[PDB]
Subunit: 218 residues, 4 copies
C-alpha cells in the first residue's frame, strides 16, 4: 500500500538513457514516479524521453555532462525549480592498449568526485523532502571504484540520518536474468517500506562455493 508506494516521488537519475540508469528510470516510472534524468547526447535523451511518454511515464531531462562541476550545479538547479526545492530520491548512477596510472586515478576519482558533489548539491532538496533517499549504483578500475563508493555511502549514511537522509550502495552481479534487473532492488530501497534501511552495500552476485566454502565479491 502506501508503504510500498513511490507514487509522485520526485527522482533524479543520472545517465538515464542506457544500461542500469535506463532500467532504473523504467522501474521508478513503472511505479508512477516523477523522474528527471540527464545525458550528454541530446538526441539519445529526446529519443528515450519520447519512447517513455508513449508509455505513460512522466520523465523530463536535460543535457548535462555530469563530469563537469558547472554542469552538476546547473542540473541540480534545474531539478530544484521543477520539483519545488524538494527531492525525494537521488540515484547516483556512474558511467563506464591498457589503462595507465593517470587514467586509473582519473576515472576512480572523477567517479567519486561527481558522486560526492551531486550528493551535496542535492542535500537541501533531499532534507526538505522529509524522507530523503540516495543510492550509489556502480575490472581493476571498477573494483577500486566499488571499495571507494561503499565507504562514502556508509559515511554519508552515518552523517545525514538526522536530516532523514538514508544512503545505500548497490552493485550489479559479477557472475549471474539481465543485470539491469537490479533496478527493482533500487526501487524497494527507496520505498517508505525500507525507511530503516541505510548504510547497506549490496552486490546481487550469483555467488559461489568451493568444496562447500562460500566465496563472494568484496
Amino acid at each position: 500500500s502506501q508503504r510500498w508506494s513511490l507514487k509522485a516521488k520526485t527522482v533524479l537519475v543520472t545517465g538515464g538513457t542506457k544500461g542500469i540508469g535506463h532500467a532504473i528510470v523504467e522501474e521508478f516510472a513503472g511505479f508512477g514516479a516523477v523522474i528527471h534524468t540527464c545525458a550528454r547526447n541530446e538526441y539519445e535523451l529526446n529519443e528515450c524521453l519520447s519512447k517513455w511518454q508513449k508509455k505513460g511515464f512522466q520523465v523530463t531531462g536535460s543535457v548535462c555532462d555530469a563530469s563537469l562541476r558547472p554542469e552538476r550545479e546547473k542540473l541540480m538547479q534545474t531539478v530544484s525549480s521543477m520539483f519545488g526545492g524538494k527531492l525525494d530520491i537521488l540515484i547516483n548512477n556512474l558511467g563506464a592498449l591498457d589503462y595507465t596510472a593517470e587514467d586509473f586515478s582519473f576515472h576512480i576519482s572523477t567517479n567519486l568526485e561527481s558522486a560526492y558533489h551531486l550528493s551535496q548539491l542535492a542535500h537541501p532538496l533531499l532534507k526538505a523532502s522529509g524522507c530523503g533517499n540516495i543510492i550509489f549504483m556502480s575490472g581493476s578500475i571498477y573494483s577500486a571504484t566499488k571499495g571507494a563508493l561503499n565507504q562514502l555511502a556508509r559515511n554519508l549514511a552515518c552523517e545525514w540520518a538526522s536530516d532523514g537522509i538514508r544512503a545505500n550502495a548497490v552493485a550489479p552481479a559479477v557472475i549471474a536474468g539481465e543485470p539491469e534487473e537490479v533496478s527493482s532492488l533500487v526501487a524497494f530501497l527507496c520505498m517508505p517500506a525500507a525507511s530503516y534501511i541505510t548504510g547497506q552495500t549490496i552486490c546481487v552476485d550469483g555467488g559461489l562455493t568451493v568444496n562447500g566454502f562460500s566465496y563472494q565479491p568484496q
Copy 2:
C-alpha cells in the same frame, strides 16, 4: 505488478505468533499470501489466527515444537498436503546466572539443526514450486548463531540454485522504527522481482562512524 506480487504464494513461517514471525505473517498476509504457521502454545496460535481472519488474512496453523525432529516432520507433512506438495516460501524464523558451555552449544546448534532440517523437509515442495525461496531470520549466543546461519544460508544458495531455490539471511538491527519492520525486506526478497537475489546476509542496522570511519555488525 506481477513482479511485485505475492498473491496466492504459499508460505511456511515458524514461530508466527510473536515478534518477527508475527510481523512476517502480517506482512505476507497484507500482500494476500496464503500462510501456514506454527507455535507450541495452541492458545496463542488460535488467538493469533482469530485476530488474523478478522482482518481478511488467510492463515492456518499447527501446534509444533520446531525443536523436535518428529514435530518438524509432522509440520512439513501438514504443509505439503494443504499446499498440494508445492511450497513457494520458507521463513526459518528461529526462537529466542549466566549461560554455560553446554547451554551455549545447545542453543546455537539446536537453532542450526532445526533450520537445516526444516530446509531439507521443505526442499521437494520448494523445488516443485518452480520459484522456491528460503530466508533465515535470526549477545554472545546470538552473534555466534548469526555467523553460523549466514554460512549455511550462503552454502545452500550455492547448492539449490539449479532447482530454482534461492536462499538469503536477514538480521534485525543491533542499533536503531520497530525492529519488526524488517518484515518488508523479508517480503521483497521473496518476490519474483527479487528472483536474482540469493546468498545475501543482510543486517538492517543503524550503523555508525567514528571520526569518519564506518563500523557495522559482522
Copy 3:
C-alpha cells in the same frame, strides 16, 4: 629480540600429534617454547613426544578426549600444576553416505562447546600470565564452523582484553606450500610483538579475481 621471543612461554595445544596442531607444536618448539599437548591415542602421543625430544623440543602431553567435559577439566588441571597456575598461550585446535542434521549440528556445536569451555578453563592461567593469548585454529560443516568460531573469537576478545587476554582466529587456505605453514602466523600472533593484535579472523587463502574483481572466503 625480546619482542619477537616466545622463549619459555608456556603453551597448551590441543590435538598436537597431527596436521596443523603438530605443525604448531613444531613452530612454537622451534622458538624454544614450553608446550603441553594432548591426544586420544596414547601411542601417537608418546610417538610424537619421542621424536620431539630428539630434536631438543620441550613438550609434554596427556591422553585427553577434548570432546568430553571431565577430560577438558582434567587436561587444564594438568596444565596449571605443571606451569604453576599461569598459561601464556592457548591454541584451540579443533579436530576434523552424507551427513545428516543431527550430525551437522552435533559436529558444529561440539567444536564450539569444546573451544568455548577450554577457553574458560584456561582463563585464570591466562590472566595470571599477564600477557594471555588465545587462537582458535579451525565443506558445509567447516564453513558454518568458521562463522561460528569467528564470532566467538571476536566476542571473547571484546570481553577479556582488560585481563590482558587477546584472542584471534586463524583459518587454513581454501585454495593455495603446505597448509600447515600457517603455523608461523599462529606463532607471530602470540608474540609480544603482536600484543596489540586481537579480534582478528584471518584466512590465509590464495584468493582470486574474476575479470578483475576480487573474491575470497567468508
Copy 4:
C-alpha cells in the same frame, strides 16, 4: 631462523622520516635489513639518516616528492641502481574550513595513483628478487582511501603471484600501545615465513562489542 630473517633484504619505504614510515624503517633496520627511503624535506631526511647510522642501521635516502610522476620514476631508478636491479620489499606508505569535492577526489585519487604507479615502477625489481613483497600502509577521506587501496591490493595480489609477488594492505587502529607498533606486522608479512600470505587487508583495531555483538572497521 632463515624463515624469520629479513637480513640483507632490500627495502623501499616511502615517507620514512615520520609516523608509520619511520617506525617501519626502524623495524626493518632492527632486523638488519637494507633500506632506501625518501622525503620532500632534505633536512628531515639527513636528520633521520644521521640518527639511524648512529644506531647501526643501514639506510640511504633521497629527496623525492612521491606525488610527482618524474619524482617516482627517479626514485625507482635510484633504487634499482643501488640494489642491482632487484628489490625484495616495497612499502607503499601514503602521506596524510572543510574539504571540498575537488580536494576529496584529489587526495583519494592522488594517493591511489602514487601507490599504483610506484608498484609498477618496482615490479621488475620485485619480480627479479624472486620473493617480491608489497604492502600498502594507509575520517571520510581516509575511509574511502582504505576501501580503494584494499581493492587494488587484492587485485594486484591476484595478478602478480606467478612472478612471485605478494601484496597485502595494513591499516592502523581506529580505536586502541603506539599506532606505530603495527610496524612489526608489516615486517612479519614480508618475511619468508609469511610467503603464503597475500591479498590480506588487515586493520589492527581494538574492536568492540555491543550487548555481545561484534563491531569493527570496514
